[PDB]
Design a protein around this ligand. Sequence first.
Ligand SMILES: Nc1ncnc2c1ncn2[C@@H]1O[C@H](COP(=O)(O)OP(=O)(O)O)[C@@H](O)[C@H]1O
Ligand SMILES: Nc1ncnc2c1ncn2[C@@H]1O[C@H](COP(=O)(O)OP(=O)(O)O)[C@@H](O)[C@H]1O
Ligand SMILES: [Mg+2]
Ligand SMILES: [Mg+2]
Lengths: 64, 412, 412, 405, 412, 149
Amino acid sequence: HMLDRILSIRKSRANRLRESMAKINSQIKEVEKRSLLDSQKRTKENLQHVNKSVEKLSFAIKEH
Amino acid sequence: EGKIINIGGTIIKARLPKARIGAFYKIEPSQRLAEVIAIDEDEVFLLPFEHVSGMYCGQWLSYQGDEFKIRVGDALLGRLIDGIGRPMESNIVAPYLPFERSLYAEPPDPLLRQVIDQPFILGVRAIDGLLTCGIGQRIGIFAGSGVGKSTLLGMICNGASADIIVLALIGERGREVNEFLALLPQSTLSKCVLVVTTSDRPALERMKAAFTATTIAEYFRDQGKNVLLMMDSVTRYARAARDVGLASGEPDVRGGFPPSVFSSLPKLLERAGPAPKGSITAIYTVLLESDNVNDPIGDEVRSILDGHIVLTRELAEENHFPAIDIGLSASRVMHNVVTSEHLRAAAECKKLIATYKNVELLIRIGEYTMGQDPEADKAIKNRKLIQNFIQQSTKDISSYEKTIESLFKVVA
Amino acid sequence: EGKIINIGGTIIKARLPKARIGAFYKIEPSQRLAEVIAIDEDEVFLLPFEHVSGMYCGQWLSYQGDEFKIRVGDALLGRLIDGIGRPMESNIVAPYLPFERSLYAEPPDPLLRQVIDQPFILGVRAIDGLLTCGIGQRIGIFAGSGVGKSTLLGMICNGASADIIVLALIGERGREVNEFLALLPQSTLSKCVLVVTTSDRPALERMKAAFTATTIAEYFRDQGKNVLLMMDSVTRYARAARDVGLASGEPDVRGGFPPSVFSSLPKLLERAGPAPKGSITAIYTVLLESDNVNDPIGDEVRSILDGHIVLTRELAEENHFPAIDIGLSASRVMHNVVTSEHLRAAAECKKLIATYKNVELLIRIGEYTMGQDPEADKAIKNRKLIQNFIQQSTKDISSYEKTIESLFKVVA
Amino acid sequence: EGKIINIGGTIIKARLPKARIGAFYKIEPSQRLAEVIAIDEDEVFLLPFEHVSGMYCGQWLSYQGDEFKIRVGDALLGRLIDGIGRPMESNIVAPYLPFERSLYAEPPDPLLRQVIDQPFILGVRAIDGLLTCGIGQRIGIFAGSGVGKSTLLGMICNGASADIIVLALIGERGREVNEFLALLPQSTLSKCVLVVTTSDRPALERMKAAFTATTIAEYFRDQGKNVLLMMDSVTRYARAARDVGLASGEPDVRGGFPPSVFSSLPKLLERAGPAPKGSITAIYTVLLPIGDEVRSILDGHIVLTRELAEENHFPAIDIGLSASRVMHNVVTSEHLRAAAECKKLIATYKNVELLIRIGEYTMGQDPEADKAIKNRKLIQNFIQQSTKDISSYEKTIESLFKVVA
Amino acid sequence: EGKIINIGGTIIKARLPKARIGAFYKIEPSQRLAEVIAIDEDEVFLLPFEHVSGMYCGQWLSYQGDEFKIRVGDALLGRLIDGIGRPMESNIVAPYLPFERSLYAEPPDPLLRQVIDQPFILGVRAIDGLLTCGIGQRIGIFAGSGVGKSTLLGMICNGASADIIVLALIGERGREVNEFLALLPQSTLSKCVLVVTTSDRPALERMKAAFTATTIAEYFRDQGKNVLLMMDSVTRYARAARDVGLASGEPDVRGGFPPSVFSSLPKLLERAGPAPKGSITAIYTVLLESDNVNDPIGDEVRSILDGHIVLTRELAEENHFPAIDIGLSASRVMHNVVTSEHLRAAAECKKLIATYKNVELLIRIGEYTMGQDPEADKAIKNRKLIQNFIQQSTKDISSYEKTIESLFKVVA
Amino acid sequence: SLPKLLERAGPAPKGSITAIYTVLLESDNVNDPIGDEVRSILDGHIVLTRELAEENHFPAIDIGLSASRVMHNVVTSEHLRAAAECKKLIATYKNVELLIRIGEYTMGQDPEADKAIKNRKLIQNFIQQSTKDISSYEKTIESLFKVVA
Ligand SMILES: Nc1ncnc2c1ncn2[C@@H]1O[C@H](COP(=O)(O)OP(=O)(O)O)[C@@H](O)[C@H]1O
Ligand SMILES: Nc1ncnc2c1ncn2[C@@H]1O[C@H](COP(=O)(O)OP(=O)(O)O)[C@@H](O)[C@H]1O
Ligand SMILES: [Mg+2]
Ligand SMILES: [Mg+2]
C-alpha cells in the first residue's frame, strides 16, 4: 500500500522539475544563457529520468 | 370486506376470502394504499408503503380492482405526475384522460421488433459524430458525481430530434428537480411529460415511477411517434426495488440486492425498444461510485442495454465538457446505422485519440521526435481541432450534417 | 383434482393428493400450466409456466400429462421455437411434428463415447491457429458484459461447416433475434433450428429453453449427423435455476447459488458431446458477472466443459478484436486433433507472445537492447506478424489451410 | 386492560385486544411505561422504556393513551425537560401547561419550498461576515472530537437574534450537560427551553427527544416568534433509532443502520423550515456513513477540523471547504462579493505558505497572494474571537470592508 | 415451589408460575443457587451459580430471595472478593461487613455532577504529557490480544495516588492475580479491594463481577472519598452476557450480541464518574474481536466513554512499548485540566510524531534536502528525545513534574 | 467423514496403498475449506498454479507452495541438500524477477542473484517436462546434481 505513496513523491518530483524547466525557459529569452542552459540540460535529462521512474513504477502496480 | 389480523412492522396480514394477487386496497378510516404480494388460505399477506403506526386489529380494507391501473391520455404533455400515476399539482383541474392502462405490459413479438437502421439526431457532437445513437437504441450513461451528468442530460433534452420527451426522475430531492426542470425551457416542456417522484416518497412509489414513465411512453409510442424516454438514475430505482424486495422477505444474492431486482430490471427496460408502430429511444443513467467498482446494478444494466456512455472525472478536472471518454465508451448499433465513409472516419478519430494518449506518455519520456511514426505525427498536429470537435458548450447546438462535415474535416 | 392453498410469488402450494413428481397441471379457469417441484403428504409445491400475478385461493388444477414433452420432427429445420416448444412464427403455418419426447434424457454410455481427433473448422483464425476444436467437443466462451461473445458466435456461425445448427438464445436481448437471423444466409437457415426465449419470460421458460434446445439437438444427432449447438448465455439458465431453487427453500452454498444449480449444470452440459451415432459440437457463452474468470458459475462451467475461450476487456478497449486472451484460454483436444508440427508451432507462438509480454515495459521506456536473448528477440521481431494473424474482422472468414500456412509463416 | 405474557429480555409480550402501533401502556404497580411495536391477533409485542427486572407473569397494563403526545405550553421557557417531556429535577414545580400536541407533523413537499430573505445573525463574526444564513435556513455543522464545538454552540446561543432558542442534548454524557450549561448565562437560560437526555436513558426516549424538541419548537413557531432549533449529535439520534429499530427486529441495509432511520431522519429533518408565522432556524450537528445522507439533505455545511484546531485559532472553522448555499438571497451583492474575494484571499495563502515554507516565492506578478501576506493579520483576527466576545452585525460589515483594503 | 424441566449447557428451565425476575432460588436436593432471567408465561429461564453435575428432570426449587444482594462495608480493604461477593482467601478469618447493597443502582443526577478540573496523576509519561486524565474521567484502553492492556494497568496501578483502589479482574487467567499483587506495595495494598473472577468460572459470576466492583466503588464513593476503579476486560462481561442472553431465546443483532448487552452495558459503564460527594475514576480495559474498526462491542464503548487510549499491535511488532498510537487516541477532559502551555507542548510534539511518521519514508528513499521542510527538520532532530519520552520501561514510573519538565525540553 | 475416507490409504501390516488424490479448489485460492482440510489430512501436497499455466510452464507445480512430508526419510542427505539448494535458487529468482523485469538489476551486487540468473535456464528445462516423457530415478538425480551446481 506504501508503493502507491512513492509515485506521489515521484510525480511531485516531476512537477517540481518541469516548473523549474519553465523557469529556465522563461529566462532563456532575456539572455549567461550558455551557463544557464547547463542547468536546464541537467533538468530535462532528470525530468526524463523522473518520468521514466514513474512509468516503471505506475506499471509496477499492475504486476501485483 | 376484510380486517387486519396482525402488523409485523413492514408487512401486514388481513383475512380476505378469495382475494386475488396484484390488487390494491384502501384502508377505510384513512386514505392509504397497500398491495397484495402473497396469498395464504384465507389470510393474505399484504404490503403497505405509506404509514403503518396508525393500525388496529380489525381495521377494514376496501376493494378497488384486480390490477393497479393509471389514467393515460394525450393531455399529459406538460404535467408533473406522481410515480403512482397521479397529477401532483393542484393549480390545474386534471384534464380528460380517457384510456386505462396497467403498469405491467409486455414487449412486442421479437419477430416484429426489427433491426434499427436510422440515426437519432442528438445535438451533442461527441455522442453523434464518434458514437451514434439509433431510433430504438437504449443508451446507458454511466456517470459519477460532479462530472456534468445533468448539464449533458439537459443538452440531450433540448437538442434532441424526438417528438415527445418523457422524463423520469426516480430518487431526487426537491432542489435537484427544481434545478433540472428549471434548466430546460418552455419549448421543451410543451412536448415533455414529467414523471417526478422524490426521495421522501415511500419505496413502492419510487419503484412504480419507472413503470409509470414506461407506460406513458408506450402510449405515446402506440400512436406512432418517436418517443424519447429518460429514466434518470436507475440506481435509485434499484435501491427502491431492493427495499421493497427485502421488506417482502427475500434472500439477497449479490451485493445486498434480492433476486427480484435482477429479474425486474429486464422486464422494465426491455419494453423500451423498437416496435411495429413507432419506436421509443431510451436513455438510462447509472451513478458509479469509487466505493464499489463492482456495483451489480451497473454490470447488469451494461448486460441488458446496448451502448454505454462513460463520463469520467479526469475529463472534468481538465476542462473538457462534455466529459465523455471516447474509447472507454461505445455504441453497439452503429455499424448498421451510419454510412461506410462515416464509419471509417469515426474509427480513425478514436484511434487518433488513443494514439495521442500513448504518444504524450512516450514524448514526456524522452523517446519521441517527429518523423519515425506517421500515425503519431498526424494525431499530434490534429490534437487541437479534435479537441475543438469533441468539446461543446451548453448553448451551442449543431445539426447532423454539420457534425459529419466537421468530422470529415477533423480526420484528414 | 385439487385446489390452491398458497401463492407466494414464485412457488404455489396445492392441496391435491397422489401427485407424481414431474407431472404438470392446468389452472382450469385459465389456460396456464404448472409443474410439480416437490410433494408433501397431500400438499404439492409447484411452479407456474406463465406469471403468477392474477391468481387467488380456491382455484382448481385439472390433470394434464404425466411429463412435459415437446414435439419434434424433421420439420423444425428453419423455424422459430420458444423454450416451452411452441412456435413463434404465426404467419408461417404450423408444421407437422410427428414425434414427441421429454426434456430430461441421459448422456450416452461413457465407453461408447469416443476419443475425438477430427478438427472442427470455426473460421476464426486465432482459435483455429493457436487453439483448435474437435468435432464433438464442448467449448465455452467466457467474458464480461459487452466484451465480444455474441459477435464471436456470429463470426463462428458464418465460419462453421456443420450439418444442422441449433441456436439457443436463452435470456438475451429480444432485439437480437432479427440480427442473428439477418446475419445468416438462406442456405444456412434452411438447416437451422432456432430456440428463442427472452429475458422477460418467467423463471421456468428461461430455465427450460436449454433442455428443449438440447433435446432438438439430440433428435438430429440420433438421425445420424454431426450437428452444432450454440447456446447464448448458459449463465441465464444458471440465474433462472438459482431463483427457482431459492424460492423453493434451498441453502446458499456458494456466491448466491443453491446446490441444485451446481448439480443441474453437469447433466445439461454433459448430454452434449460425442455419441455412438453422430455427435453434437457445443459452443456455450458464459457471462462472468464482473470482469473476472473466477466467478462461481464461471468456475463451475469451466470445470465441466473441455476447452474454454476467455475474452477480456483489456483487449476490447485496446481494439484488439477479437479479444481472445491466448494465455487464459486453452483447448483440451488441441494435442489430439492436429499434427505435430502444427502443435509445435502453436505452442511456440503462444510462448513468444508470453515472452513479448515479459519485455514490453523495457521497450516502452527505452531500455531493451537488441542482441542478448533470442526468444525475446524473436518476440519483438514477429510481434506485428502475430497481431496481423490474431486480429481479424467479422467479415474475414479464413479456411484452415491458409490459417496453418500463415501460422507456420508467423512462428518462423 | 391486559396481562403480560412473557419477558424476552428487552421485549414484553401482552394479551390485550385492539391496540395501535406506538400506543404507550402503563405498568400499574410500579409506575413504568412501555409502547407498542407490533400486534398479533390478540397478543402484542411492546417494549419497555426502563429496566425490566421485577416483572412477572400477569402484571396489568393500563391503557391511558393511544399515541404519545407531550404536554407543551408557553411556560416551558427556562426549564429542564426530559426526552419524554417530564422535568428533570424536583426542586422546581411544574407550572401550568394548557395544551398538548403529538410528536408528528407532515412537512410540506419539497417542490414548493419558499424563498429565503431576512439575514439571521448568529453572533460568531466569521460566518455572518463570510457564510451568512437566513431565518428559515436549516444548517448542518460537521465537527470532530476535541475541536471545540461546544464553545461554538454556546456562543451562537449567546448573541443570536432569536426570541426563542431550543436545544436538544440528545444522547450526551453525564458530565457534559453541566459542562455545557456552565457556559450559558441566566439571560440566555431565561430565553431557552432545552431538552436533555443521557446515555443512561433508554434508546426509545433517546430517539423521542428529537421529536419532542422539534415539536416544542414548532409550538413556539406558531406564536409569531422567530425560534432557533438546535439538535446536537444527530448521529446519536441515528444510533438510538438504530437500536430501537433492530431491537424490534429489522435487518440493516447501509452501514449498520436499518432503513427505518433512513425513513425517519428525512422526516425529522425535512420539517422545521421557513413558515409564514416567523420560522425556525435549525442547526444540526453531525460528527465525522450517514454524513453523506445528511450533507446532501440540508442547505449549508460548516466544517470544524482538528488540523485547524491544533493551533489556537478558535472558532475552528475553515472557510475553504464550508459554504452556506443561500447568501445571494440573504446578504447584498457588495457584501457577497467582498466575502467571496476574502475567501479566495485566504485560500491562496495556503497554496503560497507551502511555497514560502521553501525559499522560492517572491513578488512582482501575482496580485492575489501578495495581498494575503501583507493583509494577513486583519484576516486572521477578523475570523477568530473568544467565547464571550460578541460582534454585532452592524460592526462586522464595515470591519469586513476595511479588511478588503 | 417448582420443578426443573430441562438442562441446557448454560441455562436451566423450570415451571415456576408467577415468579419475578431477579428472584433467586436454591435447588432443594443440591444446595446450589440459581436466579431467574426470563419468563415464558408458565415456564421460566433460570441461570445457575455453579456447574450442572447431576440435574434430573423434576428437581425442585425453593424461594430464597427477590433480588440478589452483596454484603459491603468499610472492613473490606486489603481483601480479595469473587464476583458473587464472598471472600476468596480462605486461610483468613471472615470479616464483618455491616451493610447490604443490591448490584443494580442508578447513575447520579447529571445536573448534580461536579466539574472535572484537577488532574489524576497516572504514572506513564505518555498519558500524562499527551493525554492527561482528570479526577472523575472514564477512560478505556482498546487493543486486540496480548497487545499490552494488562501491562499498562500494572504501570498505572503501581504509580497510582488514589485514596482507594478497586481492581476488577474480570474473566482472565488465574495466574496473574499474584502478578498484580506482586506490584502492589503495602501502602496501596492496605487500601485496595480486588474483585477477581477467573475465565473458568461460570457465566453469571463473570457477568456480575463488574456490578460487584462498581457497587463497592459506589459505597466508598458515598463515604466521601475519590476512588480508582480499574476493570480488566469488560469485554468478558460483554460476551458472558452474550452467552447468557443469546441462549435464552433472544436474537442475534450485531455481533452475536443480543439487544440486552447494548441495554445493560451503557448503564454499568456510566454509573462511575463525578458525583455530589466523591468521584469514581475508571479505567476499562477493552478487548477487541479482531484488530478491525467494525467491532460491535468496541465501537459503542468507544462512543459512550469520555477518553480512550488506543493500543495498536503494529507498534508492538516493532517492540515500541507501551504501544500507544497517539494519533488514534484522545482525551476529551484534558483541555479543562492542564495549563495552556502544557496544551501547546502536547499539541506540538503530537504534531512532531505525526510529521515523522511520513517524513521517515523519504529519508530511506533518498529524497530529503535539508531545510526545505523546517518542521520536518525539527521532527528529525528531536526524534530521539521524543522516542525516549514516549516509550518507557515497565518498572520506570515518573512523577508529574518530571513529565512536564521533560515534555518542555523535548518540545523545545 | 473425510478423515475416515482418507486415512484408510497408507502403510499396513501386510501390503500397502500409496494414494494420490486430485483436489479441485473453489477458486485459485489454496485456502478453500476442502483444500485446507485435505491439506491437513494428507501426507504431501503439490500445488499447481495458473500463473505457471499461463506462462506455458507445464507441469505448473509451484515449488514454494509444494511440500512432501516423507522426503527426509526417503532420500539421502546429499540429495536432500541438492533439493533444498535448487528450491532456494527458484525462490531467489522469484525474488529478483520483478526487479529485473522493471529494469534495476545490474550484474554484480548479490552473489545468490547471479547464481539464480546463471542457473535459470538449467532449472527451467529441468522442471518443465513434456507429457509423453518419463525419466528414470538415476537420470533425475544426476540431472539434479548437474543443474544445482
Ligand atoms: N470481433 C469484433 N470486432 C469488432 N468489434 C467487436 C468485436 N467483438 C465485439 N465488438 C464490439 O462489441 C460490441 C458488441 O459486443 P458483444 O459481443 O455483443 O457483447 P456481448 O458478448 O455482451 O453480447 C459491438 O458494438 C462491437 O463494436
Ligand atoms: N510496556 C511493555 N513493555 C514491554 N513489553 C510489553 C509491554 N506491554 C506488553 N508487552 C509484551 O506484550 C505481551 C502482552 O502483554 P499483556 O499486557 O499481557 O497483553 P494483554 O494483557 O493485553 O493480553 C507480553 O507478553 C509482554 O511481553
Ligand atoms: Mg450477446
Ligand atoms: Mg490481560
